[PDB]
Homo-oligomer: A and B are copies of this chain.
Amino acid sequence: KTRVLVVGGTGSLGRRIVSACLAEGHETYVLQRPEIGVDIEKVQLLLSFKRLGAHLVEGSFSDHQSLVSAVKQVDVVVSAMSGNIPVQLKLVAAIKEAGNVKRFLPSEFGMDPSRQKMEIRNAIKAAGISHTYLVGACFAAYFGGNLSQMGTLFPPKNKVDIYGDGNVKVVFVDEDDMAKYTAKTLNDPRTLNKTVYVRPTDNILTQMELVQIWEKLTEKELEKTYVSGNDFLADIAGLGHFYHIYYEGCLTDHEVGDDEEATKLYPDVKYKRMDEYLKIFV
């Protein structure tokens, strides 16, 4: 059994990673930070982990030696901050000091920063820490269910902004599926010290294709305001990354080999399609 410490386990992605690690059969440790000890929902979430067999390990980002003691107990560290640069770098320093970690999987929110955005990867390299990066897809909770409307995570009402012509291919993935891929890949010899691209073919969609999925489920056409590229840029760092995705098509402008793509490496994961994802909000 691979021993895995999940950092950020009360986050949106982190709590799905804990569940996926338990389901995959890893011996799963969850960092229990002091600050969330007074949050009743986060305490009951951690207790739902325990009842499924996870071990809670106490430590905090402000206590370097507590981070060292947590990572000294496992083979793999998985980090998911959706729920930050200094914090990942504090983890990197603790991992380097501990010396025992076989693989570190920092979450990058599915966003490849090598295309300074590179500070965490540069510290991983300089520390000699083995790793796997999972990149290449927008999380459906943040870009899909809102029809990619900025400034809101709620489903659309009658109107939407269409970015450019909405004909640029984006890659969407359910966070539940990103968590399964993380749990599958973290002891896969094929992905040690590799970038793994998450590109589920059925979820390669232009913004207009995503909109049309919504319109078909609600049986009604949305009012549309088209936002040109320079009208977008004249209204200004995620805003910059959003532009790279929806106007320059950075998630789809290069090919990926089967030996480095998540759905090919892990074809047992039946990833949720965006029509099934959006069905819940209609």
Chain A residues within 8 Å of B, Cβ to Cβ: 12, 37-41, 43-44, 47, 51, 83, 141-142, 151-155, 175, 280-281
Partner of A47, one of B83, B142, B155: B155
> How far apart sit A280 and B47, CA to CA, in the bound complex (Å)?
7
Residues B41 and A151 in contact, CB atoms below 8 Å apart: no
Does more than half of chain A's interface fall in helix, strand or loop, or is it mixed?
Answer: helix
Asked if A142 meets B12 with Cβ closer than 8 Å, knowing A47-B280, A51-B280, the reply is no
Interface centre among A37, A40, A175 (most CB of B within 10 A): A40
Among residues of B, the one whose C-beta sits closest to the C-beta of A38 is: B153
Asked if A40 meets B142 with Cβ closer than 8 Å, knowing A47-B154, A47-B155, A155-B47, the reply is yes
Residues B40 and A141 in contact, CB atoms below 8 Å apart: yes
> How far apart sit A281 and B153, CA to CA, in the bound complex (Å)?
34
Among residues of B, the one whose C-beta sits closest to the C-beta of A12 is: B40
Residues B153 and A43 in contact, CB atoms below 8 Å apart: yes
Those 5 A-B pairs whose CB atoms lie nearest each other, nearest first: A43-B153, A12-B40, A37-B152, A40-B141, A47-B280
Q: How many copies does the complex hold?
A: 2
Residues of B within 8 A of A281 (CB): 47, 51
> How far apart sit A154 and B47, CA to CA, in the bound complex (Å)?
8
* Closest Cβ–Cβ distance, residue A7 to chain B (whole Å): 18
> How far apart sit A83 and B40, CA to CA, in the bound complex (Å)?
8
Partner of A154, one of B43, B141, B175: B43
Residues A44 and B141 in contact, CB atoms below 8 Å apart: yes
Among residues of B, the one whose C-beta sits closest to the C-beta of A43 is: B153
Residues B153 and A37 in contact, CB atoms below 8 Å apart: yes
Residues of B within 8 A of A44 (CB): 141
11 intermolecular pairs with C-beta atoms under 8 Å apart = A37-B151, A37-B153, A38-B152, A40-B83, A40-B141, A40-B142, A41-B41, A43-B141, A44-B141, A47-B155, A47-B281
Residues of B within 8 A of A142 (CB): 40
Partner of A12, one of B12, B37, B41: B41
* Closest Cβ–Cβ distance, residue A43 to chain B (whole Å): 4
> How far apart sit A47 and B280, CA to CA, in the bound complex (Å)?
7
